[PDB]
Amino acid sequence: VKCFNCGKEGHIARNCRA
Ligand SMILES: [Zn+2]
Numbered sequence: 001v002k003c004f005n006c007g008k009e010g011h012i013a014r015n016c017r018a
Contacts, residue, residue, distance in 0.1 A: 002010045003016055003018075005018060
């Protein structure tokens with residue numbers, strides 16, 4: 001719950017759109 005990488009409250013890290 002919440003993006004490991006990027007902080008943002010949405011999506012999982014692994015293929016995050018960052
Ligand atoms: Zn992210």
